[PDB]
């Protein structure tokens, strides 16, 4: 009746602390260990899996009091996995200056400095009532609490261990509890029958790293795995020819890209970055590797942004004449430039890289692939080009143009992008006005600067495919 699930995955997070696990591979595991205050209804307003109405979870009800403050009334008798009852103190700690957004917290949780809202300290009104506050107005509080930033941690236990040690022995309120974590290999979680919500339907879940997608496909076919992730459209015909197996695929609110270590002199200025960007023939990559199912967005611009999505925005540019002109202008001396990829952690990362190496050879740039195994990522000083992705995790263009590429983000801080002052001033402005034609035009100006500066280059939104046994009716891969 409750089976032990075996999931063959593309990767394993570096930790199970819920914010530090934010990645393509962490949420599928941490969403089973932890809960949020509220959850998105992915099928509200007729949406086919990307709906946005908010529904109760750890909070049974909530009331926006003013433009800076939201009161949450918590469920009672919710138990953390170690038997401690969750209270307003735990929720307050989760969004506190100490743990999340203060100066010392940002050292151990870097996304607390860039992915946090402009929080002020939560207020605990009573055992089951907490008020989440912001120092400046924002309408995003409630939806933020359904996001990957909103997973609730146990104050006493987390504070005692600290962020890093908690990530190796996580305790949450979710339907599965931690058993084991072997870095670069596996995570095992087991049913928590003390869960406040629906009883878990699997006895145990094992997430096993299977680096190569053909090995994942073969393991599904042999019964070694019940579910496998991160496949491509090319795998679908073979899998679906087995009557006991099936695939599912769709465009995800995430883009694959490549980016630069702009602390390196070779990438300290925009010309060679933009040269590499203008030489990418995205329709050809999409045709050869994605069966024309991946979609190319019109800039850093996605429909989930709603009022800040521009459906009429122009396409991103492909111009090898300008690319060649920019290589010569940069003074590039033929010095090999590495491009680091952790295998096919991103679907089709290595075949797309090989096609782009040919494109860059045509404009006079020598790019060398540096394919590393999980756990072998280079030190920042040895990193030049690398691949990446960004999940568009809010119904607002603030994510990820601002939270990743803005003045508080990692692209400018860790990776050294010296953005124009106009860019950082507009990032500040859009975070102070409601949705209007003015806010709409400011995001389009940020998009234009992004394309001119090329701190990163958007490739496409992947057509994400997973596969499973038909008789496995619940799949904890957060698709
Ligand atoms: O590409 P990953 O690093 O696995 O995940 C990224 C995160 O780093 C952050 O950018 C949010 O989007 C994910 O896709």
12 and 72 in a single domain? The answer is: no
192 located within any domain: yes
Q: Which among 374, 368, 404 has a CA at the least distance from the CA of 386?
A: 368
> How is 394-405 classified by DSSP, letter by letter?
SSSTIIIIITTT
For residues 249 and 329, is the Cβ–Cβ distance under 8 A? Answer: no
95 located within any domain: yes
> How is 366-394 classified by DSSP, letter by letter?
-EEEEE--TT-PPPGGG-SEEEEEEE--S
Question: How far is the CA of 11 from the CAs of 14, 26, 151, 185, 208, in angstroms?
Answer: 9, 9, 21, 8, 8
145 located within any domain: yes
> Which residue range forms the structural domain that includes residue 355?
254-461
d(CA 288, CA 278): 19
59 and 117 in a single domain? The answer is: yes
389 located within any domain: yes
Ligand 1 centroid distance, CA of 337 (Å): 23
Name which residue sits closest to atom 8 of ligand 1, judged by CA.
Answer: 23
Q: Is 421 exposed, middle or buried (0-12, 13-18, 19+ CB in 10 A)?
A: exposed
Check which CATH number belongs to the domain holding 187 and give it: 3.40.190.10
46 and 91 in a single domain? The answer is: yes
Q: Which residues of 348-361 are buried (b: 16+ CB within 10 A; e: fewer)?
A: bbeebbebbeebbe
Q: What is the DSSP letter of 43?
A: T
Which residues contact residue 284 at a Cβ distance below 8 angstroms, ignoring those fewer than 6 apart? Answer: 355
147 and 282 in a single domain? The answer is: no
Ligand 1 centroid distance, CA of 297 (Å): 18
d(CA 412, CA 119): 22
Ligand 1 centroid distance, CA of 389 (Å): 5
186 and 306 in a single domain? The answer is: no
Given 156, 187, 216, which residue is the final one in a domain?
Answer: 156
88 and 125 in a single domain? The answer is: yes
Ligand 1 centroid distance, CA of 184 (Å): 17
* Residue found under tokens 């209007």: 436
Name the method of structure determination. X-ray
Q: Which residues of 311-323 are buried (b: 16+ CB within 10 A; e: fewer)?
A: eebeebebeeebb
d(CA 125, CA 372): 50
Q: How many domains does the chain have?
A: 3
Plot region of 46 (φ>0 → left; ψ -120 to 50 → alpha; else → beta): left
Check which CATH number belongs to the domain holding 145 and give it: 3.90.76.10
230 lines ligand 1 (CB under 6 A): no
162 located within any domain: no
Could you tell me where the DSSP H helices lie in 290-344?
A: 320-330
* Residue found under tokens 């000083």: 381
Question: How far is the CA of 220 from the CAs of 12, 30, 143, 472, in angstroms?
Answer: 18, 23, 36, 12
Atom number in ligand 1 closest to CA 22: 7
Q: Is the peptide bond before 400 cis (omega within 30 degrees of 0)?
A: yes
Resolution, given in Å to one decimal, reads 1.4
Atom number in ligand 1 closest to CA 345: 4
């Amino acid at each position: 009746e409750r089976r032990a699930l075996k999931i063959g995955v593309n990767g394993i997070p570096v930790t199970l602390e819920p914010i530090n696990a934010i990645s393509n591979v962490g949420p599928r595991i941490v969403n089973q260990i932890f809960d949020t205050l509220v959850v998105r209804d992915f099928f509200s307003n007729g949406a086919p899996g990307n709906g946005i109405n908010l529904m109760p979870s750890l909070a049974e009800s909530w009331e926006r009091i003013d433009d800076k403050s939201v009161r949450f009334k918590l469920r009672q008798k919710v138990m953390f996995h170690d038997g401690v009852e969750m209270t307003a103190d735990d929720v307050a700690y989760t969004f506190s200056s100490e743990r999340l957004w203060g100066p010392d917290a940002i050292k151990v949780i870097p996304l607390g400095g860039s992915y946090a809202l402009d929080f002020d300290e939560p207020v605990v009104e009573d055992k089951y009532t907490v008020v989440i506050r912001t120092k400046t107005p924002t309408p995003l509080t409630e939806s933020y609490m359904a996001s990957w930033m909103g997973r609730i941690v146990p104050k006493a236990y987390y504070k005692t261990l600290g962020t890093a040690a908690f990530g190796n022995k996580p305790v949450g309120t979710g339907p599965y509890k931690f058993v084991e974590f072997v870095a670069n290999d596996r995570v095992v979680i087991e049913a928590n029958d003390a869960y406040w919500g629906l009883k878990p339907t699997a006895s145990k879940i094992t997430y096993q790293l299977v680096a190569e997608p053909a090995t994942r496909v073969a393991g599904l076919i042999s019964g070694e795995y019940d579910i496998v992730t991160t496949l491509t459209p090319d795998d679908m015909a073979l899998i679906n020819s087995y009557p006991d197996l099936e695939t599912r695929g769709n465009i995800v609110e995430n883009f694959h890209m490549f980016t630069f270590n702009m602390n390196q002199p070779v990438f300290q200025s925009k010309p060679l970055r933009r040269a590499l960007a203008l030489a990418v023939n995205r329709p050809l990559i999409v045709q050869s590797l994605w069966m024309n199912k991946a979609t190319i967005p019109n800039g850093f611009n996605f429909p989930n942004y709603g009022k800040t999505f521009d459906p009429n925005r122009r396409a991103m540019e492909y111009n090898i004449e300008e690319a060649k002109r920019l290589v010569k202008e940069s003074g590039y001396d033929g010095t090999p430039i590495t491009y680091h990829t952790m295998g096919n952690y991103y679907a089709n990362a290595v075949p797309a890289l090989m096609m782009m190496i040919e494109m860059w050879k045509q404009i006079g740039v020598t790019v060398v692939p540096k394919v590393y195994a999980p756990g072998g990522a280079p030190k920042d000083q040895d990193s030049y080009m690398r691949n990446w992705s960004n999940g568009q995790w809010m119904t607002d263009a603030w994510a990820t143009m601002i939270c990743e590429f803005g003045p508080k983000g990692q692209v400018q801080k860790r990776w050294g992008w010296k953005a124009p002052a106009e860019f950082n001033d507009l990032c500040t402005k859009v975070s102070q006005i409601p949705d209007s034609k003015e806010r709409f035009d400011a995001f389009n100006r940020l998009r234009d600067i992004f394309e001119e500066e090329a701190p990163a280059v958007i490739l496409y939104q992947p057509f994400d495919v997973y596969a499973a046994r038909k008789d496995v009716h619940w799949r904890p891969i957060s698709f």
